[PDB]
Design a protein around this nucleic acid. Sequence first.
RNA 1: CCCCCCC
RNA 2: CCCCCCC
RNA 3: CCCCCCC
Lengths: 339, 339
Amino acid sequence: DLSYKHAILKESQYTIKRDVGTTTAVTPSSLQQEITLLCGEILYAKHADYKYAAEIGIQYISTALGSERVQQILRNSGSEVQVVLTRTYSQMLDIHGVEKSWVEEIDKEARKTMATLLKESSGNIPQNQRPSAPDTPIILLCVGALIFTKLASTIEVGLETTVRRANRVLSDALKRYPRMDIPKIARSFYDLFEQKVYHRSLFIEYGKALGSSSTGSKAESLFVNIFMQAYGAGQTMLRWGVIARSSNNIMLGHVSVQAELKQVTEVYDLVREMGPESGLLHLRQSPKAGLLSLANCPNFASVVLGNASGLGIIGMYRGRVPNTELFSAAESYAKSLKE
Amino acid sequence: DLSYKHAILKESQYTIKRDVGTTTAVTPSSLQQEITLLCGEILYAKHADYKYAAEIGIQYISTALGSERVQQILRNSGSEVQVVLTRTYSQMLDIHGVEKSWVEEIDKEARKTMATLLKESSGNIPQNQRPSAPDTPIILLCVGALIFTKLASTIEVGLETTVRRANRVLSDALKRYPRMDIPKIARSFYDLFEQKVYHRSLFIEYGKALGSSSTGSKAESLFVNIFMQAYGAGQTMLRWGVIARSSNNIMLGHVSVQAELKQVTEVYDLVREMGPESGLLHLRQSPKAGLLSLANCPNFASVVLGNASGLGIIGMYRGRVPNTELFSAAESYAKSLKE
RNA sequence: CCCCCCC
RNA sequence: CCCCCCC
RNA sequence: CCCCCCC
């Protein structure tokens, strides 16, 4: 059945159309040196409103890939959003859907903070501490990638995890910019990813275009590391299933587990059939996701969760254990094997 | 014989003609923003009559796919129903076959409820609690998809299951709209699916056009999840047969089971021959369904039902057990293997 | 005739 | 319906 | 995020 369902979904002669009357903003590569400034003036000043930081990160992505490539990416993502270009005025940027009041506020706040830290201090600002640093857009996109790995999770868990992991992953940027509010920027990125779902596809295309590069700075290598940490998002049950098989859990040989193993292997075969893009299904909110669910094998899922709980892997996972006796037996065996 | 029967049914040079003098209603995409309102004014008010909620969900489907694509879908489903377009009047909708009194009643009831909940309360209605929310048509179609998975079952079982599953599947919508009557909407959808059988084909085409989409909201992902839960409808005996084979039931090696295994494998080969569209045969009430029946293998069916009963899968399945001795032996072995 | 559980 | 830990 | 010794 599962192969037939995927065959129906894949073999479609008709293309969906959505967001027909909508538009979005991009910034041409000719403005990259400008957007960098903006992407850094968000980082070293303490701003009251961090509402469009995610849009500025996506603007930098658009400068990197190019306006035409970004339009093509949005078009092949199933969304008929018409790209609107970015202009300059007196210079500053007039990004579509980003209020000019916001851009002026961010610029003025950063200029005032820079003046205050230059007047009082000894005037020895290093090359990495200024807003026009060239890795500041990647530093913002690193907060974006941290909150990207938690798009399958909830908002509160995502924000808490983003802040906790960014105090260590982004320690160097925090030292360079003492006053960068990872919570508010992470909230902005979560809002962008939820509202504009095609920007998930744009962000993934940037991740690919960055990982495929021949050279990169440490910021881009960090961004790619986090982006790849997001790969199996929304499918931790499959990873824990292969973990359970590697652990040689005895309760995998139970009668009901052996009964469901056929369709479990069917799900894994479907994973292989989709191939490399299967991992990005839940990150993209591809409607085709959910063909990879193991919820139709309650006993296998309970055994997998029990094995994870025994090994300590389960952590604070919020999934359901359908069959509690199998869960407890598997947990006991996994603890025994671990000890 | 079974391959020959399918060859006769498939190799037909003549097309059937039905519903020749009949007509049905569609709504053009230009009215989607309007139909959404209607599809949500059914959800947050307590209506005396929920008679045409299913037709309003199908109207939203018609806006999504388009009027011309919907006409083509109805034509290729074997039904010569002439599509009638939807108009507006003073604005509200005049849907063909939907009485204007009903639309006026629903709109007035929703407006009165909104006025009552705005006058008494503190006036802090969130963006998701209002009728013009853009996921309300998908919320109605989710009740429709829940009752869709029970079209092979009976009406009472379908309604009971729809309400039971919708208290959990649709918990968030229920929180957003405290007064949405899943029983009456489910009854309306069951009535639509029984009366207009071509709307099963339309609803399946919407499911495909939604699953094939590159992006979607959580409502559309939920709808696709339920729609795929409906895939093997009307053929639980085949699923339980492959379950029995996976369980390695000893009574499958009995003399009579081994006698019938040849034509059983013939049925499964026919399943593979039809391919992806085989699962939707009973959902569509395709007359070609019934070639997949295992009723001509009473001993295999009894063994399969016994295995299911032993594993606890049988639940409250109402199929017949032809050979009770095989059923009991298979149930005993399945319980023994499970323990 | 067929279908019939749970998710 | 699905998802849900850590890195 | 990754890396981190010796030759």
